[PDB]
Structures are given as structure tokens and as C-alpha cells.
Amino acid sequence: EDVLIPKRFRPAKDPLDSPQAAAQFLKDNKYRILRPRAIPTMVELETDAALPRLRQMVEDGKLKDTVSVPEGTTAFYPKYYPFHKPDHDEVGTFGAPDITLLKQLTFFLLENDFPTGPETLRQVREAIATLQYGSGSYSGQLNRLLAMKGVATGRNPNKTPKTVGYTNEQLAKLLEQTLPINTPKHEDPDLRWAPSWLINYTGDLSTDKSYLPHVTIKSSAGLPYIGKTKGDTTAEALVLADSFIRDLGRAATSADPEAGVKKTITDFWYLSCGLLFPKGERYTQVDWDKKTRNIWSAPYPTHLLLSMVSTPVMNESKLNITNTQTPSLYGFSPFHGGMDRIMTIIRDSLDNDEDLVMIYADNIYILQDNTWYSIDLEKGEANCTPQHMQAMMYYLLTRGWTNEDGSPRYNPTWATFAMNVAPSMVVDSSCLLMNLQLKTYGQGSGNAFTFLNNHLMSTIVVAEWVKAGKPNPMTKEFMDLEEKTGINFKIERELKNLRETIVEAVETAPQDGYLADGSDLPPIRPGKAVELDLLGWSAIYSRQMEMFVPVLENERLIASAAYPKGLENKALARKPGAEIAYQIVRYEAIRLVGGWNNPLLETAAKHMSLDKRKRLEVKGIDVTGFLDDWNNMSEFGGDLEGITLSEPLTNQTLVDINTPLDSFDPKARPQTPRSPKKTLDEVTTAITSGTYKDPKSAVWRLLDQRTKLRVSTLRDQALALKPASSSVDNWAEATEELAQQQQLLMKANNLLKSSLTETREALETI
């Protein structure tokens, strides 16, 4: 009645929703508040004047005729006041639990003796009663900042790779194994130009092209354009990103590179300050004001410049354990036989009594002693030092941005941005909340390098596990790697008696229903799942397909059923029939990702899906287009890219999403592009012995030296890289002689200072 349905959660009044109360709380907790910096007042300039090369893009309507730039004689302090919903005064449709589904689950439990039915109903009701989908609160966000600072500086303070004992080259040798990469396509431009110069526009569809990375148009522009999207500020971003990279390049080759580079960095300070966006999630009601995860929303120009380094490399590097002999999980999909490929790799390891490691950003998976371990970095991003990102930049510029002859696919200006400035713009820099400019501890979550920097930190933890003789994750010896690496982590899952569990999963596989005998019905009694929680997926054995298939981890499935995400796109929500199409999508997607294998959930969701489809026929609205392009309407859209929901879900839909394109032979997987014959273990034993301290390549040696020399030496460094980046006659011997020359002047300790510290100082100058 009103006892079955839990009461709606009404968040308490937030006592820290004012700058005074927020500042006092952070002060009482010793959290660093910066002296606020101001942005010059916006000036409405002619886009034709600011971007003359793109005059044709203005007249064709691809850019606004005016551009607003911070050039004014007066300045302003930026202010960012995000919405937190639901809140004490607004408990509406946003974050509303699916009470209709709870009613349906109860009715079908009344009529069906499903052995897992009572546990499914209780779990959905408990999730509705204890969880809340929403954007948390100011208190939640502020307490989260304290927890991040705690991971960075508390019980286990962060350590740079150098402090742990790795050079840039030693880390690169590990990343060749844990994150194998290819070079960007030959047709893609080198890192040598201003972003706007990557736009080739005239009108001709046969030639017109943009080599810039794809951006989310509806996402936040960030500073200095609060309240604007990326689509709203395209011209502004190009003008600002162009001016920053050009002013940096000029300043570095000026009569005083230290004063020049520092002036540019302070003039564009706001390019290092992220809007502290409250992340929409299924939070615990009891901890609503204790924890709101934060999205560090990078300014559009900073995101564009960073993405120009990473995305041309990563587009060509979808290499993982299912298609390459690497522990990496980058670009993994459990669909189209992905999960069965993983289960084949796991089963072969267990039969051959071999240990196994898998890495995905802040997620580590270890198979040892007939046990599966899921290890996650604790609040990952907070463990990142600017030096971790600098080591990733080294790896991308040496292994990615390199020609076949070994010459660099970048010039000194882009080597300066990537190595000497960029890591301090998004790591240990600052954020904006209300009128408060707060310190950021670690890397800003959501920045372009979030995955890459987290993947490098997990690589360090895994390399140290291999070095320590692979101690079991449940022992003190493994937990001691926290202090050894400066990286906090925790064992999130332990799946004991793995061999036996896989045998049980195969033997308990149902004979009835979906992917079993092929009828359009859930099994009465589902088989045992292999609860790997591999990027949120469990494995279930299919008798029909004779393979393991993925099912969304139970806790995630229940949370998503209890609190569905609605249409979080104003434009699509405005379109007619979209909201009623979303209703069908919600119940079909929950079935697709794994609800099909939960008999109570599948009976209730199928009913909801067909009843919503019947309501659509009554109103006479055609939503076929929306149901075909359902991906953008669902949180589960990012997987099943080529499936349509225009026809109701059947057993054939489940067969199709699990159909492999090719047969799998693990021995047939190509080796990594670099050091193919070497295993991660052989690389670790070499590093332990002191190998790969310095790269053999003089170009790479110059890039490593660049991480150690102060900003006043940048012009000399530019002269050292100029022959190689220009590919002049006999550049190799010239770069070789210039590196040897630069190595000698490095005996002057006064020339040794991290440019990353110099960047941070200038960013925080008043």
C-alpha cells in the first residue's frame, strides 16, 4: 500500500550551501583555499578578425560572426553555483525511483514461485529505500574533497615514479606491455600547429576535414565561460587554445624564457581551474551529505590541447587481452564473444597453473592461487602526481608521436606544452565551487588523461607485485605495496575456488529459456554466475551458444532497476514521442544487459515493455527512429551500438549481441607492437637489475632531459630538438651531439628544477 512503497527521500537542508559556511568548513579541516584570481572582462570581437583563416566558416554559418574573449581593462572573479537535485525544496521526477516496477515485481511474486524471486523483490525495494539517484549536495562535494586530500597526503602520501624508483624510460618499457600503442595514422598532422589550423574548410565536401578531436557539444565549456556549452563556445575555444600554444611557444624561445613562460601561464591561469561539477550517481541516502563524487570540468581550450596529444594515438591503439598478448583491457567489450574470450584465457591459465593480470585504468584483476581478485585504486585520481602524467606524456611522445626513422612528430613548442606545462594544468592544480578557488589534490577526474594516468598508476602497482614475487593480494606483503608505490588501493572482490566455480557455472546452466533451449523466457532457476565484476560484468554459461556470455553485475543491475537515469539531454527530451520511446528503451535495456536472466525481473520488465508499447499504439505516435537509435537514450547504450529496439526483445536479440565475428585462438593473438617477444615479467626483472634507465635514442634522451631542466633553459632545449623536429640533413648525429652537450650542462645543479613546479607557482600567482 504505502508500506510496500518506501517514502521518497527528501535531502536535509545543506548548512554548507553558502561561500562563508563552505570556506569555514574547509578552513576547520585544513583544506587549502587559494587567493582568488580574476579573469579579464569579455570583449565582443569579429570572428573574421580573430580567426582570419576561417572567414569562410563564418559566412557559411559554421561559426558565430562574433567571439567573446577575456581582453578587457577590468576583471571579474568567476562564480560557479551548480544545482543539486533532488534537494530539500525540490523532490520531483528527477531521481524518482521506479515504483511502477516495484509494484509489478510484487504482483508477479504473488503469482510465480521463482526460487530467486523473493531475493530480487527485497533487493529492488531495499535499493529504492536506501539509494538515491541524483547530483548530491554541497556538503557531499566538500566532504569528497577532504577524502581526496586524505588519499593524496594522509595515511599514504603520493609518490612520484622517481621516488618509487622508476625513470621515464623504465615506465615506458612497462607501458609497452600494459598499454601497447600504435603511432597516429600517417595522414594525421604532427603536434606542430595551433588547433584552428587543423580545420580544412572551403565548402568542397570531397576535401573539407577537421583533424581536431571529437567533443561533446552539450558538455560544459568550463572557464572562462560559465553557463555555456562547448557548442556555444567553439570559436572562443579555438581563439584561446591558439593564443595559449602560440604565446607559450614564443615565450620559450624569447630572451627571457622564464619570465615569458611564467607570464603566459599566469595570463591564462583559468585554463588550469576546473568547475567542480557534482556527478549524477546512485548515492547512499544515509551518506548523501558525506559523499558526492566530483567531475573536474576542464576548460574547453585545455581539453582540446590535451586531446590533440592522446586521441590520435588511442584511436589507433584498441589493443587488449582479447586481441593482443597484453594484460590491458583498453577498448574491451564483453559482447560479441568478448566475455567468452576472457573465460578461455582464464580457463587456460587455471589448466596450465599460470598467474594472470588484467589492467583497465584504476582497475586491476589478478588470478592467482585458484582465486580471482578485483583490486581498485582507492579514489584513483587523488593518487596522481603531475610526474605520473609527465611519464605518460613521455610514453605517448616517444612511442606514439614518432616517425619510422625515429624523428619526432612534434616541434619544441608542443614538447614544452606536453612535457613542461600540461601535467600541472590538470594535476595538483585548482577548482571552482561557488566563489571559492580551491586546491585540487591529484588529477582532476574527467580530464582527457584520466584513464591514461590511472592506467599508469595501476601499471606501477602491478610491476611492484611482479617484483615482490607476486604476493597473494590478501597478504600484508601485497598491502605493503601501498607504501612502496604511494598509491592507495583495496581488494574489492575475492572469488575463491575459481576452478570449481567455473565447473559449477557450466553444470548448473539451465536447460530452459533464453540462450538455453532458445525459448523467449527467463530460466525458472538461473545457473551459477562467475562473478568476475570485470568492468561491471559477470559471466553466465549458455547451453545454446556453448559459451560464456556477460550479465551485468547483480548490484549494478538492481541499482539501475530501482533508480533509472532519465533522458539527460534537453534537445532530445523536447522532441515529440521521445519521452514515451525512452520508457520502452529503459525496460528493454535493463533486460538486455542481464535482466533477461532474472526471472522475476524479466517477467515484470517484459510486461512493462509490452504495456508501454501498447500505450504507444493507442496514442498513434511513431517512435521507430528513436527505438532504432536507442543508444543515446540509455546509460547502457555505449555497448550495443548496432542493435535496434523497434521490435520487442526475443532470444534472437540475445544470440546477436553475443555472436562473435571470428573464432578465438589465444595463441593466434599478435604480440605487442614494441618488445613483442618480452613478457611483463622479463621487463620487470630487467628494471630490477637497473636496465632501461636511459633511452638509447637521442630524441628520447632530449625528452627525458626536458623533465629535469628548469624553464629558463627552454630556448637552449628548443635549439637541441630543432634539427630532429625539422628533419634537417644528418639530424640523427646532430641530435646525438646536442643530447651529449645538454647532458654535460646538466652537471650544473642550478639548472635542475621541475618545470611542473614552476608552472604550478605561476598558476597560483596574484
Partner: peptide, 8 residues
């Protein structure tokens, strides 16, 4: 073959 639009 490589896009070359002057470099920064």
C-alpha cells in the same frame, strides 16, 4: 599524404 597546413 600527411596533413601539413607557420608552425607554433
Amino acid at each position: 599524404s600527411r596533413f601539413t597546413p607557420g608552425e607554433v
